[PDB]
Assembly symmetry: C8
Homo-oligomer: 234 residues x 8
């Protein structure tokens, strides 16, 4: 997808930013219609994992684990129990630091989702397909927030929407366009990822502008990708 | 392009100074879900009013929202910070100075108190949309209540109510025509509805606060600002 | 609507009354029938929000927030922590009083709800529509109680029933009859709201008669609205 | 208003009114409404407790103490005390606290059974006066009320009432009914629940007379028309 | 009123009424009503404990002690103590507290089975004297009552009852019924109560009589007149076991 | 009464009855009834535990100690002690407390399987001697009973029983049945559960005898008619 | 009884029986039965843990220690201690308490997958010997058994078994079956599947343990036993 | 036969020494269940990913997995042991020497992040499977995410994502022909998909770790290994 390429070729910052990752909540309230199970969610429930990946892939952030904090704490208990008596095989000693802290924490909401099946119309032209074949429209809105831990104020809050027309051309292969491409992943997931990745870039952009963080070369503020995504926020 | 509610909200007259306000949840108190063939669990209304409100309070240029949903998370992070620096070994460039959590005298809270949606044909919609009297458009109505509570006393200072009614139909794949009891939107209508209501509520809120002396304008004359009188009139 | 106009034009009391607002529980047990979701409630779940609005709008009461008492308390902790060390910017100082108390607390129940689709009969006659055209009947019963915090005894206990025949004439506009007028609100919404509004007035009347609270002008005990709602209460 | 209400509100007086604590009346019918109702729609309103509290008051025999929101009460009292302990509160805003009113008996109960069927013609049709094609409704609710001695925990009384109501709609939202003749604007099942609880309160008062828990002001009134009406009902 | 009630209300007297703690009778049938009922509609009423208490009282053998609402009781007693500890309460309003009454036995139970099917013709049609195409109902309930020794935790008594009732509606809200345990005797009764409830109640009332008999036979409690062990009702119910 | 019941109530006597604590028999079939039953109707009764207690009592080999309501018991004993500590209790109402009777063996169990199929013609039709289009049902239950040594926690015995019952209704509420012909007034699936549990208790008794967990009064009677009958069944 | 049970009950003996604490076997298939079953009817019986315990005993290799109901155990022991601490209990009623027996190993597991579909013809029709239009049933279950070292928390052994059973009914409640690599059973097929799988897992476990020196055979020569080598090859 | 992923996983080059890793759950975060006529409660994907991961980590010969799911059970058993020998009376042949629970510097965790399943006919399936264009095969797609966390600092060291797509159809009862974007399988296709994704996940993880200097190979000659290069190309 284009978002992944843009995300992976940003200009570099002075240094990577520590950030603690809390959840991206699904707040659409939406599930699939008949004949799905009543319990089948309309959107994957994996936004947080995607965010962690998107933050790392940006080359701008060091994500700190918080979802499984209790597990972390246990493991550290077990380490301490294994070395407090000074008998542990030295090749097996694990030096413990204090957990890395962060001044900002990142959180989010999937704020909306719409999906409908369509045929012909504008989609059929851009795809180069028959005016009777049925395609899909998937739209997701994501909100990402960065909170200041020192004060509890919101440092940054971007909103992204991605809308994707798609249709199956081969078993398990989809052609799609971002309001032209090939994808092997489900359209709805491509949408969720693309929205989250874009959100991270929006995030990085907003932070540069507000002096939360700066680029290695301030000259690189006018990088093609950065202005591309800066303009997607009007 | 973007709704009238957003435009009005983002061009309000300024307050003497921005007001800190703590935001807790906006509950969906409609009791409503989508009918067959929806999943029984599909909510009629989006479940993200709180995020929308935080964004709208910020966008008004009147408020600095303090997020409280993850207060418990915030507090843990501060524990983790203190534990990392109490021994004075942390790399000086990685030191995180802690202030006190910013406090607020007022707390804003709310409810989505009503929602109705039905599909319609002909009538006023058909005329204003300029469509066939057999062609179907949709009506979405959402009602929101916003309350301001005094943290020092616990008195409920303000309690405003807004209703937004939106007529819509899809004209192109993923594009909707709408009327606010004509515009175009790329967003699903029930969300356009909820957003407009929340944004309107924040404006109603600001007005009520001025009138009750909860907060004051920078320019005392601008009590007769076009936007403020517009929304003042929607409340009578 | 009539209830609202009347509620906002009550004669004034000697002084506004503090009251703690606790929930109005939905005790109908009722949800919407096919094709609604099984989980769709028959009645909105916002009676309490409406009570607070009605109490303030009566200009008789000062409602004290209790649903978010725990949040309140937290904010007060945060306030104290921010100023106990005396370093806070003097203009950023927030003086804390004790939470305002109340001798009475108001609570309630939605004790019954009926909703049915109908044709012909009285509706058709008064609405002036075909005996084949369909209207809705919505009926709600509400109970409001005022409790003495000092003794735990019930100070006042009023009951209201609102019955509304309605039908849609235009997209989103209903003509209704109160067992003719026009409303933009959903009928069940208007029914619940009207019952609660009427309830507060019933409450206020009962309170006057039982000496729980007094009017500035005792002569206005014969106010048009007050006697109107006194007549309904029998 | 129904006969039950009339009777309840015209009982002979007791020596002095009785404090009684009311905790919830549980729906123990296990019953919900059939298709096309939501699976979650209860057959019977979930508001019996509120109704009982009202009925206890209306009888003029009892002063009901509500306990459902006891924890809220307690909080309010915390807030009151915190507000005046430092003696700075304006004397006009001072709230004098008494001790919460206590009671020796606790009343509790269950809705123990419910049946509803749609009927056509038959016997009802005659007292209603219509053809074997019009459909009327039968609603039957059974309630149990218990009185508990708080001092000892003995269950002093356990009465049972059944109300059966035949009804059918004549006008939109207006019902004709017969109590195994009147008109009601209230939904029949709710008229039934209410009539059951009201009747129960009277069964309770009678049973208390008979067990020496309380007696009448005027001993002659021990064989009052209403009290005797409902005693015969209870056997 | 059912025969079970008549019999329960005319048992011979004991030396003294027996204190008993009443805990719940659990519905362990696992059964709900079929389409078109709500999935949540229970096949059997959920009110056996309320009925048990009434049956224990109506027997004139027991004094039931409240335990379902034990926590509420305790609260009320707190409130009481708080109201008179400062010695200012109006003397007419003073409430003397004893210790909660104890009991050496607790009674508990299970509804262990429930069967219901609609039938036509057959033996029912004969004994009811109705058309072989008219529909009647069969309801069967099984109840288990246990008496537990609180001093030792041993189970003192565990009786089992089944009541089977054929019924059909004859008038609006009036049912004619038969008690399969007397089917061939051809006696038919009328009831205003729903059949599954008459069934539940009749089983529970029978269980208590079974219970009183077992206790008599095992010396858990005694009759005033030892001679009255040969009372008609006691041998009637002694034989059903 | 069932063959199982006759056999259980006429076993050879043990040297003396055995105290055993009874904890639950869990329904571990995972099975509920099909359409048009309620989704919530269990396939099998939920009263196996009460049945076991009755069966253990009825064997004349065990004295079951009630543990399901252990917490209630303990409460009752608090209440007794509170009523007598002050030495004021009415002498005829005095309750002497012993210690709760203890037991060295715990009995517990699982219903591990259930099958129900309604059938037509075939072998059933022959043994019943009915029309070959008339429909009968097959019910099969598998039960597991375990005895645990409380001193050590070792599992002393683990027996498994399967009962399969063919039945069809011949009179209203009366069933003819066969255990791979008899009459029962009880529902076939209950007869199935009960019979399995009764057989289980006998199995248990045999295994205990064989392993020296407990002994019979006359050691020669190991060759009792009933004991060998059920011994051969496994 | 099936090939798995005969085999489990005729294994070569170990040096001595092994204590193992049994915690649950979780159903991790996520699977329930389709229409017209109740939505809540599980595809697979929920009794794997009871079955494992039975299998472990039946192997004559293990002594299972009950842990599912450990708190009940603990309560009963409290009651015993309470009954004899005051030295008055009748000596014949005295219960000597040891410490709960411990174990160096802990056995745990998961049912990790399940399939069921109905079929016609193919290998089944041949091994069953019926026409290619007559229908048989396929049930397949995958189980994972783990043995964990309590001293270190490392996983000591981890076997995986899949059993596939083709089946169809010939008489009411009697089935023809095949252990897809012919037999009779009175039990439901998915039952025989789970049980055969759990029994196979225990043998796989015993084998893996011998090979890794977790436990030893009486006679190391018996390493080439017919049953043991049979199960070595299926792994 | 057995999937290529398994074959590749079990023939990796050895690391300098095997690495202890603690494994907590792999959550199903697809939100997906089976459609009618399945039970509403039937999950689309097996709920046994964690067992499968533990199995995969062992099989790679790079890791020693420490299961933590029953940590509480473990701890209880150790209590029981200690209580059983603290009085020094236990039978010597039954004596159990307790070490400390083995610790690990890294902790592995993961999510099933996506799942789609469809029944299909004709197209590529009919061609490669060699079946009638009306004959039905199924498509299963699963996406897995594995994360490695530093237990000493809480930094998330690695987060790899894998997708497996499998076309399949049953050819004989309980035997499937399948294609991994022809082979035969006795196991169910959705399980084959989940297993293959997880195995691939582990190799991706090993690769990422080499790259980030978390670990290196025993034999320097093996730095450019065919299997390691194969699976790097699937990521890029």
């Amino acid at each position: 997808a284009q978002s992944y390429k843009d995300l992976t070729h940003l200009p570099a910052p002075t240094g990577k930013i520590f950030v603690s990752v809390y959840n991206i909540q699904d707040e659409t309230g939406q599930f699939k219609p008949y004949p799905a199970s009543n319990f089948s969610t309309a959107v994957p429930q994996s936004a947080t994992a995607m965010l962690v990946t998107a933050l790392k892939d940006s080359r701008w952030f060091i994500p700190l684990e918080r979802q499984g904090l209790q597990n972390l704490l246990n493991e550290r208990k077990i380490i301490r129990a294994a070395q407090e008596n000074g008998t542990v095989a030295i090749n097996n000693r694990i030096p413990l630091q204090s957990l890395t802290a962060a001044n900002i924490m990142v959180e989010g909401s999937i704020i909306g989702y719409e999906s409908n099946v369509k045929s012909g119309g504008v989609g059929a032209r851009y795809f180069g397909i028959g005016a009777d074949t049925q395609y899909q429209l998937d739209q997701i809105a994501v909100n990402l927030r960065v909170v200041n831990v020192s004060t509890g104020e919101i440092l940054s809050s971007v909103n992204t929407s991605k809308t994707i027309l798609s249709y199956e051309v081969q078993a398990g292969v989809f052609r799609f366009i971002d309001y032209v491409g090939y994808t092997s992943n489900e359209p709805v997931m491509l949408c969720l990822m693309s929205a989250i990745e874009t959100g991270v870039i929006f995030l990085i952009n907003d932070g540069i502008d507000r002096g939360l963080w700066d680029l290695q070369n301030k000259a690189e503020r006018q990088n093609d990708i950065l202005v591309k995504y800066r303009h997607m926020s009007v």
